[PDB]
Design a protein around this ligand. Sequence first.
Ligand SMILES: CN(c1ccc2ccccc2c1)S(=O)(=O)c1ccc2[nH]c(=O)c(=O)[nH]c2c1
Ligand SMILES: CN(c1ccc2ccccc2c1)S(=O)(=O)c1ccc2[nH]c(=O)c(=O)[nH]c2c1
Ligand SMILES: CN(c1ccc2ccccc2c1)S(=O)(=O)c1ccc2[nH]c(=O)c(=O)[nH]c2c1
Ligand SMILES: CN(c1ccc2ccccc2c1)S(=O)(=O)c1ccc2[nH]c(=O)c(=O)[nH]c2c1
Ligand SMILES: [N+]
Ligand SMILES: [N+]
Ligand SMILES: [N+]
Ligand SMILES: [N+]
Lengths: 396, 396, 396, 396
Amino acid sequence: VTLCSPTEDDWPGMFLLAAASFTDFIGPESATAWRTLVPTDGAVVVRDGSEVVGMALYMDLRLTVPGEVVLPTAGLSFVAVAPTHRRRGLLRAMCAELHRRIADSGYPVAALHASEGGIYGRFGYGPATTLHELTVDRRFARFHADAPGGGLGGSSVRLVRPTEHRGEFEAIYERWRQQVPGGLLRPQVLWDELLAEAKAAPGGDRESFALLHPDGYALYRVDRTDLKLARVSELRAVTADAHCALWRALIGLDSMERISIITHPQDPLPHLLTDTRLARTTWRQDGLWLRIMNVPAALEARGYAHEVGEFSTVLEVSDGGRFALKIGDGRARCTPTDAAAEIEMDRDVLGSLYLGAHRASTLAAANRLRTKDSQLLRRLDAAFASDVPVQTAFEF
Amino acid sequence: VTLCSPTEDDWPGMFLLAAASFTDFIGPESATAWRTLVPTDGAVVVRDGSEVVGMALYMDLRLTVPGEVVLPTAGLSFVAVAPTHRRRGLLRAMCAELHRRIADSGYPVAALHASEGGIYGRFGYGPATTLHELTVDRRFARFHADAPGGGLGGSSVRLVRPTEHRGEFEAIYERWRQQVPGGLLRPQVLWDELLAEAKAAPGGDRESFALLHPDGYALYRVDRTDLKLARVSELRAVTADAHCALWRALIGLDSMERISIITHPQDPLPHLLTDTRLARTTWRQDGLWLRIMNVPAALEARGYAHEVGEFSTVLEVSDGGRFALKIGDGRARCTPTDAAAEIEMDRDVLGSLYLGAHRASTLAAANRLRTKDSQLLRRLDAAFASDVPVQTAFEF
Amino acid sequence: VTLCSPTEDDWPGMFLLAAASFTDFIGPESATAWRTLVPTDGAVVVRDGSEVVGMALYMDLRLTVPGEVVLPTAGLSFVAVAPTHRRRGLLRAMCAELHRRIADSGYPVAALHASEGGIYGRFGYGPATTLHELTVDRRFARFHADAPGGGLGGSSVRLVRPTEHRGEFEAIYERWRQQVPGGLLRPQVLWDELLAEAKAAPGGDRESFALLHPDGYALYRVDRTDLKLARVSELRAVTADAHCALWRALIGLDSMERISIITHPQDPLPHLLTDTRLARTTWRQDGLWLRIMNVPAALEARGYAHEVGEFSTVLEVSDGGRFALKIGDGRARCTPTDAAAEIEMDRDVLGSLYLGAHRASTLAAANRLRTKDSQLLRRLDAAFASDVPVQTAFEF
Amino acid sequence: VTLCSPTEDDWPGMFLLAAASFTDFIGPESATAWRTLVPTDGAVVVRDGSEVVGMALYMDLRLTVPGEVVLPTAGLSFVAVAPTHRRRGLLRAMCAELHRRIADSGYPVAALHASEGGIYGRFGYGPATTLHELTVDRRFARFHADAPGGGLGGSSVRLVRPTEHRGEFEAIYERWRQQVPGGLLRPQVLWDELLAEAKAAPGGDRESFALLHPDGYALYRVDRTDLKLARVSELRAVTADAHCALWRALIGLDSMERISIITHPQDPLPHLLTDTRLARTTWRQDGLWLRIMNVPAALEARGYAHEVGEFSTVLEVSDGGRFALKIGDGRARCTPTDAAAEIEMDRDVLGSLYLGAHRASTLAAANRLRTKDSQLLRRLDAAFASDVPVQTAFEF
Ligand SMILES: CN(c1ccc2ccccc2c1)S(=O)(=O)c1ccc2[nH]c(=O)c(=O)[nH]c2c1
Ligand SMILES: CN(c1ccc2ccccc2c1)S(=O)(=O)c1ccc2[nH]c(=O)c(=O)[nH]c2c1
Ligand SMILES: CN(c1ccc2ccccc2c1)S(=O)(=O)c1ccc2[nH]c(=O)c(=O)[nH]c2c1
Ligand SMILES: CN(c1ccc2ccccc2c1)S(=O)(=O)c1ccc2[nH]c(=O)c(=O)[nH]c2c1
Ligand SMILES: [N+]
Ligand SMILES: [N+]
Ligand SMILES: [N+]
Ligand SMILES: [N+]
C-alpha cells in the first residue's frame, strides 16, 4: 500500500472506485472535464501491491468571505476508500499528504462538502454554512402589502429555456458570488454540466425551465414522482426586487401544490407572505466545511463588523499556534505571541466561526470554545458576524 | 350580536365553544383553574340575541426581555368564533375591545401563540421567538472530547418521579425564566397542570420521568405509538454543565432509537456531539407572538448590545407614532418627534425585532422594514440582538 | 345440531358468539336493550349436542318506500356462525327458518346490512341503497352565489350539546324518515344508543357536537387519530335551506382540513360550491339490502312515476311467481297469470329495483334482468324511478 | 399585452409555455400533429410587448348527444397563462375572444376537460359527464350464473398486439361513438397517438396489449411500479356480450391482483359478479364540460324521453335568453318569448343537464336551478334523462 500522484493509467481505476462509492457519480466524460479544475499534483491515489483502493484530490477554487474578499481555496473532493480496505487509515494518510501539499502551495483555507457529519472534524474541518430547505404550499401563498413588485403594468420576469440564456445566468451568478460570503467562482466546465442537467433524462429527471429577471434567475423542474412538486435547483438574486419578482413567478406555478428550494437560514421569503408559516423548513444540514490552513493569513484577510469597538486578545488554536489578535475598523491584526491564551479552540471550531454562520457564544456553551471572560465572547460574536448572510454556492 | 364581559353564567357556554374549537381543550376543571390568571374585565364574549358565539381573554403574565428586564404582559388566549358565525368580523371586534382594555390598563406589550400564521399580523402581532424540533438518533451519538461531564466518578443527574421533586423544578425554572429572553413566570396553577400531564392516561400519554441536576431538569415520556421515540416535553438548564449532563443521561436511554425535543435555534446540543448532523432539525415554527402596545415604553425598557456605538435615528411605526430613538450604553431613549422618518415599519415587524429573534436586515430584504441608509440597518441589527439566545417558555 | 328459538339461558352464549364474531359488538347491556325490537319467535339459535354455534334474528322495522308509503319490514341482524362450524350449512338452515316465519307473519319485505357482498344474493336479497362518502377539503370551499343562506343578519344554525336537544333531533328525524325512501322509524332504544355514542370514550372516540337548524341537524366529531378531520356521523335535513345552512356551519370548522360524511349519490353538496371537485367521493358501497317476501303486495304498495304512461306486462320472478303487472297513475296492479313472461329476474334483482336505486337498463345489460323488448325496459326504468332520492337511514 | 391569432413563428413559444404548464405535454411533434384539428383562426395567443405569455384554441369535434344526434362542437384545449402573468385577466380575455369566434362560426356547443373544477363555471361551462374508477380484486371475482358467455366451447376474445388490429379498433370505436351520448369522432391523428402510447417507453410505461372481440376491445398495460395492477386504458363494447366476454378475459389475468378502469357510473360490471362489492369505486370526477353556445339550437337538436307526456314551460338562461320550451314525442320546440319565466338557471347548469348526467331535481336542491313548481322539475328530470348512459370518449 503506497501513496502516489496518479498517472494517466490510474484514472480508469479511479473512475471504477468512483462509480462504486458515489451513487450520484457524474460518469467518466463529465469526470474527465472536472479534472481540468485539479492542479498538477492535486491528486493522491493508493494502489495495492495494482488496482486503486484509495483516492483524494483538491480543486483550485475562489471563496468569497466577509468583506467581499476572495480567497484561493483548496476544495477537497473525489475522496473514496475501497470497501475492501476500510480501517487501514488510508483516509488519514491521504488527507495528511494533501494538507501538506495544500499548505506548501500557499492556500490559506481548504473546503469540502461532507458525505457524513462525523468524519472531517478530526482533520480540522468545521461546518461553515447551513442549508435550509423551504417547502411552500403555494395554494395559500398571498404576498404581503409591503412586498415589492405587486403593482400594475407588466412583469419583468420571463419564462425561458435555460440553454438559450447561459450568458445572462453566468453574468448574474458572477455578480452574486462576488458579494456573498460562501460564493464560489463557477468555472466554464461547471456551467456546461449545469445546463446538461437542465435537459430531460429518459427515465430520469424532467425538463428544467428558467425564470429570468435582469438581476436574478431561478432554475426549476417538476419532481420525477411527485408531479405536484416543483424543485428549485438554483435561485440567484442580486437585488431584493429580483428575489421578490422571482418568487411571485414561482408562486404563479398554479398547477403545483408545493415549491421546494434549498436556501439559507436568512432567506427573506417567509416575510414576503402574509402567512410566514406557509414557507416550512422541511430539512436542515451543514453545507460547506472549512479548514483554516494558515490562521493569521485567514483571520487578517476577512473583514469584521465595524459596529464593535477596537479590542485585543490572545487566541490559541490547538496544535495550530497562539496569536495576538487585534480587531478594529473591521480589520484584524494577528501576530505570534507566547502570552497567556484568553481564547482556546480546535482548528475546526475556527472554520465554523470564519464565515459568520455560527456564534462563538453557542460553541462556548458546548465548550468547543474556551474563555473565562464573557465580554470577550460577546465581542467575538459581534466581530465575526457577517452583515451579508452567508450562503452555499454549489456542491463540489 | 353584542360584546360584553362574561358573567358566571356565560362560562358553561364558553367551555362548550372551547371544546368545539380546540382539540387539546384541557377541560372544564383545568379551565376553571386557569381563570385565576385572568384579571377582572380581562375577558370578552359575544352572544347571539342567548348562547356564546365568540370569546377572547388575556392573562396577566411577566415576560423577560433582553437585559433580564421583566415586563407586565397581556397574554391573549381562549380565542374562538363559533363555526356558525364566521366572516362577521367578531374577531376584529373582540381583539379591538381587548387591545383598548390592555392599553388603558398600562401593559407595554401583549403576547399570544398563534393557531395559524395568517391571522394575527393584521392586529399588530409579529412572531418573536422560533421553535426548533431536534430529533437525535441516539444509537450513533458520541459526545465530543471537549464536552463537559465526561470524566470518571459518579453522575450528578438522577432519574426521579416528577411529582416528588416539584419544588426543585419550580426553583430551577424560576432561575431560568429570569435570565432568558422569552421567559415567563409560571404560576402555581400551571405547575399543577404540568405535573397532572406527567401522569399516565388510560388510552392516552404514557408515564413521564424526570432527569434532575442541581442546575437543570428534563421531563420526558415515551411516545404513545412509536415506542422507540422518547419525547422531551421540557428541558430547563441554567448552566452549560447541567445542559450537557442532562443530554448525557438522555443519550443513555439505550432502549430508544430517537430522542426528540422542541428547543430553540441556538441550542448547543449539536456541538456536544462528534457528528453535529445526528441532531436533525425535523420541524420549525413561530413560537411567541408580540404586539408592542406602547412603542416608547417597550423600546426604553429592554437593554441593547453594548458593542454597537451610540447612534440616533427616527423610527415611524405605521399608525403607531414617530419617535426620536437614541441608543447607547445598551440603553435607549425614545421621544416624540415630527422630524422626517429614517426607519419605517408596521407594528408587527417591531414585535418580531423586539426579543432579537429576527434580524432587521432580513425584514428589510422583504421590505417589511424601510430605510434608505444601510449603515442604520447594521446598527439596528447589532443593537437589537440579544447576547442570551431567545427561547420560548410555554404555550398559553 | 338442532335449530330452536332461544330461551333466556341461551343469550349469554349468543353474546359470546357476538363478541367473537363482531369487532363493533355494542356489548351485553346495549344488546339487551336492542332485544326489545325482536318479536317473540323472531330469533333462531343452533346448539351443538350445549353451547351456541349459530344465531340469527329479525327486528320489527318500518321502511319508507317511494310514494311516502311505510311497509312493515323484517330486519335481519345478529347473524353469526361459530368459526368451529363453518361449511355445515348453518346459515342456509337459519335463513330458511326465519324467512318461513317472516313470510307467515305477513311481512311484505325483509332487509339487512351485509358484512360481505357475496353472501346474501343467494338468499334473495339485493342491494337497494348506495352509500357515498364525500370528503371536502374545506380550506378551499367557497359557496356559490346561488347557494341559500349567504345573506346578512344572523345564522339560524346553533352549535349545541347532543344530549340537551334529543327531542329536536327526534322530531327532525321523524319528519325526515317519513318523506324519504329508505327511511326507518328509529325507536327509543336506538336514540339512547346514538346519544351514548356521542359521549367521549377513554382511549376511544372524541366528544360529539351538534349543529341544529329548525329543519335539520348534524352530529360530528373530530377523528381519533387524524385531528384535522371532522367526521359527520349523521346529517338529516328536511329543507334545502337547512341542508345548505348546516354545510355553511361545517365548512366554518376553520381548525379542520377535511370534513367527511357518508351520504347518498344525489347529495347536492357538490353543487353548493364554486368547485364541485372539492367534494371528493372517497368511498362507495351497498347500503340496505332488500328481499321481496311477497311480490304482488310489495309492487302494489309503492308509488310509481306519474310521468310514464299506462302500460302492462308479465313479470316472472325465478321460483317466486309470475304476475300480470299493470302500472298507471303512479299505482300498480299485480295479479297471478300463466301468460308468457315478458320480463324475467331473480328475486334479488327485484329488491335492487324496488327503492329506485338501480336502473332496470343497467341490470339488463348484465343480464340479471331478461326481456326481448327494450321499450319495456325504458318503461320499467322510468316507472320504478323515485323522484325523492333514495337514502340509507341507519345500520342495524 | 395584445391578443392575436398566432403566426407560424409563435408556435415554438407556445410549445415552451405548453412544456412549462402541462406535465403530460405530448411534445412538439405530437403537438404539431394535433394542430391539424384546429381550424384557421381557431387559436389565440397573448404576447408581451415578444414571447408568448398566454394561449388558447379550439378543435373541430363531433359530439354525440341523446337521440344519437351528432353536433359540431368546439373543443377548448391548449389553454395556458405564463406563471409570470397571473391575475392579469388573460384567461377571461382569451376565452371571450374564442367564444365570439365559436359562436360566429355557428357551433351550438363548446366543450373542454378541466384541469381544476373551480375555473370554467364562470365562463358558462358545466360538467356534463362523470368519470368512475373501478378497481376489481380479481382473485375473488366469480361471474354470476346469469352473466353471458359462461358456456362450453371456445372464447370469442383474442389477445393481440394493438398495432396489428388498428382497423378493427377504429371500426368498433366508430360504431360505439355514434350510439353513445358523450361519443366523439376520433380522427386519424389521435389513433396514431393512441397506438404510439401503446408502445413500451424506456423508463416509462410498459407494453400495452389488446383483448379483441368482434363487437368490442380493451387496451391494458401493467402499471409502472405496482406490478400486480393492470390498468385498462380503454374498453369499448357495442354489445353486452362483448362487454361481458372482455371482462371474463380481464379477470383471467391470473398474475394480477387488481384490474383498474376509468368508466362511467352505469357500467354494469359490478352486476356481472356474485359479489358486486369486488368492483370498488376508488375515484370519481367530472369528465367532459359543456357550454351551450346557442340555447334553442342545442335544446332542439337532442332527443328527449318518449315516456314523459307533452308539456310546455318558459326557461330563462341568465344573460342567455328566455324561451318557450315545448317538449313531446321526444322532440323539443324552443322559441323566443317575453312571458314570465317558470325555470331559471345559469348557462353552466344547462350544460350539466344537457347529456342527462345530472338530474334537474339535484341542481334545484342546490338552488342552481329555480322554479316554484315541483311537477315541472319531475318533468324536466324525466325528459332530459338519457336511456343510453352518458360516457366520456377521450381527454382533449
Ligand atoms: C461531482 N463529482 C466530482 C467532483 C470533483 C471531481 C474532480 C476531478 C474529477 C472528477 C470529479 C468529480 S462526482 O464524481 O460525481 C462525486 C465526487 C465525490 C462524491 N462524494 C460523496 O460523498 C458523494 O456522495 N457523491 C460524490 C460524487
Ligand atoms: C390551554 N388552554 C387555556 C388557556 C388560557 C385559559 C384562560 C382562562 C380559562 C381557560 C384557559 C384555557 S385551552 O382551553 O385548553 C386552549 C385555549 C386556546 C386554544 N387555541 C388554539 O388555537 C388551540 O389549538 N388550542 C387551545 C387550547
Ligand atoms: C348493532 N348490533 C345489534 C343489532 C341487532 C340486535 C338485535 C338483538 C340483540 C342485539 C342486537 C345487536 S351488534 O351486536 O353490535 C352487531 C350485530 C351484527 C353485526 N354483523 C356484522 O357483520 C358486523 O360487522 N357487526 C355486527 C354488530
Ligand atoms: C393533449 N394535448 C393537446 C391538446 C390539443 C392540442 C391542439 C393543438 C396543438 C396541440 C394540442 C395538444 S397537450 O399539449 O399534451 C395538453 C394540452 C392541455 C393540457 N391542459 C392541462 O390542464 C393538463 O394538465 N395537460 C394538458 C396537456
Ligand atoms: N460581507
Ligand atoms: N439578554
Ligand atoms: N318518493
Ligand atoms: N340516447
